[PDB]
Amino acid sequence: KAVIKNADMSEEMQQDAVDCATQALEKYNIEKDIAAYIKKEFDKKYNPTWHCIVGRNFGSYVTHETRHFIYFYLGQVAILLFKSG
Amino acid sequence: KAVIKNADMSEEMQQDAVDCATQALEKYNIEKDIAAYIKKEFDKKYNPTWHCIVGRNFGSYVTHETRHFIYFYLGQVAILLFKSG
Amino acid sequence: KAVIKNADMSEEMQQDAVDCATQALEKYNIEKDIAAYIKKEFDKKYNPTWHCIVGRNFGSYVTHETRHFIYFYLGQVAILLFKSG
Amino acid sequence: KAVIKNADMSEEMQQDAVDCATQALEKYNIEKDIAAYIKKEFDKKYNPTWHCIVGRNFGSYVTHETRHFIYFYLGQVAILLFKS
């Protein structure tokens, strides 16, 4: 139950972010811990370095490697995932 | 009016981040634009690449270069600024 | 902020290596130019021949004379310096 | 997919670097292990001592025996091979 707001990453990698996010929401309830789960899993499957922001009220300005950015809503939370560094 | 919650950065850089954020708050209203002002200036004065999150409700898990991380409260908004890449 | 990751070198030559790197770090910006400064300085003060590799992502397998190897970080950049005959 | 950035070595020596390097990538994934695989072989095909650097972002200033230097790109990874 995900709405992709903005993305610059593979349609296949997009699904992984959403799939990984579903699992992160199932296992954790605190936004910091959800973000930790996502960044780590994306650090394993795809090479470092990833960063994840999970929340309902925030603004962000980041720099990402091309084809490694996704911003979407999952459940009650917005998820920002991108790779830089 | 600034409460620094966690930092791994020089006090000179710490004060600069707080000063730069205050200026961003004076000129802008949207958290995304506030974050953009800080990140851009911090890309100029200090080397790229920086990332900034400004909001009232969000959780984050990031990886940052040593001596280049700050998380502080300014006004009613939490500001996360760090360098990765 | 220098971390010696691996070394087979005298502590004074080790201290010399980091000092030489810091100055190279002050004046030059291209890794090739940083490396050239280091190799030259170590070729005069200690006898030739030295080789220097500067970068952030690289792997090496080299053959070096004993007591003439150092691999260390200064900030985010790795410096490999060694003598082979 | 081999583009040589600069070289001072013979044409067969130019070519041999590519074959061993291409093959090593098929077998290994970590840059240090790639370098070890190639450098050992180049100690055999031409006699020691050789040195190998494998990575995507690095700068080097080395001193090499004349007619024994190569720095080239393979895919996204740069390979520096020389004899000292």
Binding site: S60, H64, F69 | - | - | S60
Partner: peptide
Amino acid sequence: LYKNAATQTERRTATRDAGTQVRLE
């Protein structure tokens, strides 16, 4: 006989700046 050599990486990763705004509260 020894010659010197210099090498630099020209690999370029493409970079993009991105801003996002969330107001669910």
